[PDB]
Ligand SMILES: Nc1ncnc2c1ncn2[C@@H]1O[C@H](COP(=O)(O)OP(=O)(O)OP(O)(O)=S)[C@@H](O)[C@H]1O
């Protein structure tokens with residue numbers, strides 16, 4: 001009813017400006033006064049925090065937020081919970097990225113140049129490769145979970161926690177999830193940064209999930225100008241319905257992105273349009 005986010009958490013983190021929000025959390029820039037470090041603190045949203053479902057969900061996700069050490073992955077530093085007069089306010093402390101999500105880039109700027117999109121997604125592949133080698137499937141690859149920093153570094157975040165626009169067909173069906181599910185979802189992001197649109201939209205998540213399972217994506221070159229057939233092949237391989245027909249690893253996907261960036265033919269099956 002009237003929870004508000006305090007100016008200090010746990011007498012160590014002094015909150016500065018609000019950076020963003022999502023369906024659960026509000027993310028603030030903060031100063032870690034103990035380590036003299038600027039950090040991002042993800043706090044359960046004040047307007048949701050007294051709602052038992054949301055509180056409990058936040059706690060279940062905080063204890064599963066994967067802590068990986070890689071230049072393209074947002075580090076997770078700590079978790080905690082502030083006592084306030086309105087009740088407990090749980091939070092996660094993570095690496096601060098001064099930058100913009102791919103969601104916000106596509107919204108405000110439209111599609112990226114193809115070379116830039118290739119570069120960003122190839123860097124995201126490195127993050128995912130590292131995660132997979134450490135036994136962690138991301139599970140929630142989407143444009144909001146990839147940022148480009150002010151120094152043009154790619155940062156992927158929010159790994160390992162178990163919208164419908166970016167789910168893999170196997171997630172839509174409740175089947176087993178593995179590295180190829182992250183490939184598919186990253187293929188959805190690639191599709192969107194190239195064309196300005198996700199592959200599938202609909203009036204409900206049931207309708208969007210149905211499309212992931214049953215309907216072929218419109219080839220990117222048909223959705224938007226300046227896109228090559230070689231890029232169609234790479235994107236549509238990532239988006240193959242059967243996991244066995246996708247890139248089997250994030251590294252394999254990267255290798256094809258690197259070919260296309262260099263004007264070399266990709267290994268992905270050719271796609272013909274008219
Ligand atoms: N480490 C970070 N550094 C800077 N900004 C961040 C960071 N993490 C998240 N943000 C921003 O905070 C927003 C909310 O992040 P999240 O709570 O993870 O929700 P989301 O990923 O946008 O969407 P949902 O809720 O998962 S659908 C992001 O969209 C960014 O705008």
Ligand SMILES: [Mn+2]
Pocket residue numbers: 022144145157158
């Ligand atoms: Mn996120």
